[PDB]
Amino acid sequence: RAFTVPNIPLQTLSNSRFPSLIQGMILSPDASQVVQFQNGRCLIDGQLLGTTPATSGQLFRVRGKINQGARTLNLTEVDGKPFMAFDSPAPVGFPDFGKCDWHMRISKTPNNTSSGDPMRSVSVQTNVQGFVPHLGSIQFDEVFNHPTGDYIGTIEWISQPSTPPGTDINLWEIPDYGSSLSQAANLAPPVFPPGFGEALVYFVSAFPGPNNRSAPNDVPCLLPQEYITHFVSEQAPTMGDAALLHYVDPDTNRNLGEFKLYPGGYLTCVPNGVGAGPQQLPLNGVFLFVSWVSRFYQLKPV
Amino acid sequence: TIEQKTRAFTVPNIPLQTLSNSRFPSLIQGMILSPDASQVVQFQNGRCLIDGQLLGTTPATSGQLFRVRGKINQGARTLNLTEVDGKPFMAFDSPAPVGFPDFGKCDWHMRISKTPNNTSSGDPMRSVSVQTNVQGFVPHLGSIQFDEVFNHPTGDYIGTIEWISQPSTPPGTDINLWEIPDYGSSLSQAANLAPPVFPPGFGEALVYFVSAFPGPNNRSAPNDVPCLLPQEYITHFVSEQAPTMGDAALLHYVDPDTNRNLGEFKLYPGGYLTCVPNGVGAGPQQLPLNGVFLFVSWVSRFYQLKPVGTA
Ligand SMILES: CC(=O)N[C@H]1[C@H](Oc2ccc([N+](=O)[O-])cc2)O[C@H](CO)[C@@H](O[C@@H]2O[C@@H](C)[C@@H](O)[C@@H](O)[C@@H]2O)[C@@H]1O[C@@H]1O[C@H](CO)[C@H](O)[C@H](O)[C@H]1O
Numbered sequence: 001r002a003f004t005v006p007n008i009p010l011q012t013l014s015n016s017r018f019p020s021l022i023q024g025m026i027l028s029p030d031a032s033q034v035v036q037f038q039n040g041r042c043l044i045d046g047q048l049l050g051t052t053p054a055t056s057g058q059l060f061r062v063r064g065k066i067n068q069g070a071r072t073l074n075l076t077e078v079d080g081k082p083f084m085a086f087d088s089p090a091p092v093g094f095p096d097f098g099k100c101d102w103h104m105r106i107s108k109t110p111n112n113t114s115s116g117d118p119m120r121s122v123s124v125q126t127n128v129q130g131f132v133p134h135l136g137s138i139q140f141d142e143v144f145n146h147p148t149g150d151y152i153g154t155i156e157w158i159s160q161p162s163t164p165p166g167t168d169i170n171l172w173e174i175p176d177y178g179s180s181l182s183q184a185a186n187l188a189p190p191v192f193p194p195g196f197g198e199a200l201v202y203f204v205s206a207f208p209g210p211n212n213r214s215a216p217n218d219v220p221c222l223l224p225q226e227y228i229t230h231f232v233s234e235q236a237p238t239m240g241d242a243a244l245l246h247y248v249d250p251d252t253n254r255n256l257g258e259f260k261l262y263p264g265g266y267l268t269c270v271p272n273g274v275g276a277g278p279q280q281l282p283l284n285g286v287f288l289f290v291s292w293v294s295r296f297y298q299l300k301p302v
Numbered sequence: 303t304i305e306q307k308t309r310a311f312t313v314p315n316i317p318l319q320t321l322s323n324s325r326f327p328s329l330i331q332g333m334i335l336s337p338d339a340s341q342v343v344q345f346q347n348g349r350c351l352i353d354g355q356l357l358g359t360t361p362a363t364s365g366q367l368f369r370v371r372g373k374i375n376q377g378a379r380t381l382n383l384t385e386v387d388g389k390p391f392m393a394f395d396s397p398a399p400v401g402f403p404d405f406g407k408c409d410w411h412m413r414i415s416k417t418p419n420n421t422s423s424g425d426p427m428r429s430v431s432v433q434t435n436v437q438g439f440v441p442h443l444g445s446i447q448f449d450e451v452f453n454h455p456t457g458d459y460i461g462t463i464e465w466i467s468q469p470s471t472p473p474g475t476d477i478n479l480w481e482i483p484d485y486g487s488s489l490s491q492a493a494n495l496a497p498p499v500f501p502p503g504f505g506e507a508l509v510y511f512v513s514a515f516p517g518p519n520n521r522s523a524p525n526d527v528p529c530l531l532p533q534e535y536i537t538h539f540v541s542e543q544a545p546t547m548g549d550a551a552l553l554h555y556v557d558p559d560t561n562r563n564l565g566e567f568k569l570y571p572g573g574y575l576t577c578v579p580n581g582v583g584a585g586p587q588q589l590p591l592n593g594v595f596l597f598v599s600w601v602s603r604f605y606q607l608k609p610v611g612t613a
């Protein structure tokens with residue numbers, strides 16, 4: 001089967017770290033930025049990595065059991081199936097927002113009542129000893145004075161980390177999945193700046209909450225979720241060091257820039273000096289597969 | 303080109319339990335028939351022709367689905383709708399902005415926040431409630447009405463429905479997610495609504511994909527939201543735009559462990575699936591959720607399906 005990418009304009013595609021439209025295409029503010037996102041990680045032959053779900057249905061949700069009067073949520077998969085401890089960093093689709101506090105909204109499932117607001121607010125710190133999703137649990141900040149059961153929900157908004165006090169949100173980072181005595185197993189590996197004139201391309205969407213900059217919380221990811229779903233369904237073999245893509249204006253059919261999609265599931269371009277890069281481009285473009293190329297193929301600056 | 307006009311029809315090759323509801327972003331949790339065999343549906347989301355033509359308020363992807371955005375003035379009750387990206391909603395063109403919720407016969411309990419963030423402290427989340435059968439619910443005209451006066455700063459707000467409850471009026475009536483809200487008004491009907499989908503008859507019945515949505519109901523059971531197509535099907539069709547080459551696409555719902563066919567279904571060009579229930583009580587709800595629908599062949603609308611399930 002021949003390799004393709006979705007024929008849908010970028011602005012209509014979705015972030016792979018939480019379900020939202022892509023609102024920008026950027027380079028990392030720090031050129032030396034290494035990333036290790038656990039969601040939005042997929043080899044271009046359809047091999048999912050980290051905690052990455054095949055589809056958005058599973059993405060950015062948390063599910064587990066909690067006892068009345070406890071602080072600990074014992075995680076399951078989003079569909080309610082048991083989470084295998086020591087095996088994965090966290091359940092499939094578990095949020096990977098590091099360096100922030102999580103303000104979550106959850107509810108007991110399934111509904112078994114005829115009245116009442118089922119929604120509960122809980123907060124989670126991601127750098128505390130109780131944050132151990134790799135061991136199957138996370139700890140809420142307060143005692144959970146609500147009925148025992150199976151709860152499901154998501155992060156509604158984020159804020160500056162509680163510790164160290166004063167530090168800002170940094171969504172380029174992931175939380176600490178492991179424990180003080182055990183590292184998280186099967187983490188999707190880090191992605192390093194490619195060098196040689198190339199730079200990693202990130203897709204960004206805004207997420208609710210304050211920060212020290214009084215500005216939007218921007219969530220960078222490596223691939224649109226629809227690309228991941230496509231790769232999982234298509235399972236097209238990788239036949240070069242990179243897939244050459246053209247970013248095309250669908251209205252005129254003009255090529256707006258060349259990109260390389262690497263087998264590891266990330267995109268690069270060559271910025272044409274400072275001030276240049278994919279952030280200069282309109283967001284209504286469609287990426288089109290042109291050809292398999294070697295890693296030594298020299299990209300035209302964008 | 304020749305390639306585009308000769309592009310072969312396909313469906314996403316992913317187990318059903320891994321696919322998403324097209325009325326709100328969530329995993330599909332079951333397949334059902336409508337409780338009423340005569341049930342007509344007119345969902346505005348999850349509507350797409352199998353050659354990729356979107357209908358109603360249906361978004362191409364999940365990123366835009368089940369979101370509400372608009373401007374509200376401090377001290378007012380009126381949310382003036384925009385598209386999810388903040389661009390003006392061209393009213394009279396559509397029943398509502400793309401991705402706008404289509405949950406009828408219930409009260410909406412929403413959570414919204416001012417966008418973009420311009421704050422360095424505090425909780426930005428605001429709770430509002432919306433009734434869908436009141437005079438102020440006029441999304442087609444460009445606005446919906448909150449139940450209480452909005453005593454928060456004027457501006458641009460984005461959010462979603464967090465949970466639903468029984469409709470306020472008529473008192474005592476239950477949630478009915480088989481229905482859509484009234485998008486129009488008394489002096490103006492909603493233009494360009496996705497059309498109704500009628501039961502096929504002649505042994506066939508419509509297949510619905512369900513996912514539970516938070517909130518109570520009169521039956522003390524989950525609020526199951528039925529939709530016609532997984533969202534991934536919609537995205538696939540929009541991307542592929544494969545020409546429709548027959549009256550219907552014959553699908554087999556195949557067990558990925560044994561490669562055996564668990565049931566025959568017809569996917570009609572209007573963007574919905576049917577099966578033949580194997581007697582009273584039988585249906586696709588009896589099948590495991592880990593099956594994969596595979597395209598077998600184009601067939602005529604008169605093609606008869608092997609009955610599915612057991613009475
Ligand atoms: C636990 C909590 O709610 N902390 C609040 C804090 O609350 C109180 C409570 C009682 C007293 N008192 O006895 O006098 C004083 C303060 O109030 C501050 C100031 O409003 C909150 O911090 C601010 O808002 C949050 C959302 C952040 O944006 C923060 O930077 C602001 O200064 C504080 O909220 C906590 O802040 C910490 C970081 O300091 C984390 O972000 C927590 O998630 C957040 O709950």
Ligand SMILES: CC(=O)N[C@@H]1[C@@H](O[C@@H]2O[C@H](CO)[C@H](O)[C@H](O)[C@H]2O)[C@H](O[C@@H]2O[C@@H](C)[C@@H](O)[C@@H](O)[C@@H]2O)[C@@H](CO)O[C@H]1O
Pocket residue numbers: 114115116117409410431467468469470473474518
């Ligand atoms: C305005 C308000 O807060 N009313 C309270 C009721 O909630 C409303 O119920 C109506 C249905 O009558 C409708 O669902 C609205 O959306 C609710 O705001 C509340 O009713 C109870 O809880 C509801 C969520 C619903 O499940 C209903 O069946 C149930 O009776 C009553 C009782 O707690 O208090 C009212 O003040």
Ligand code: NA
Pocket residue numbers: 126127128129130131132133176177178179180
């Ligand atoms: Na940890």
Ligand code: NA
Pocket residue numbers: 434435436437439440441484485486487
């Ligand atoms: Na109305």
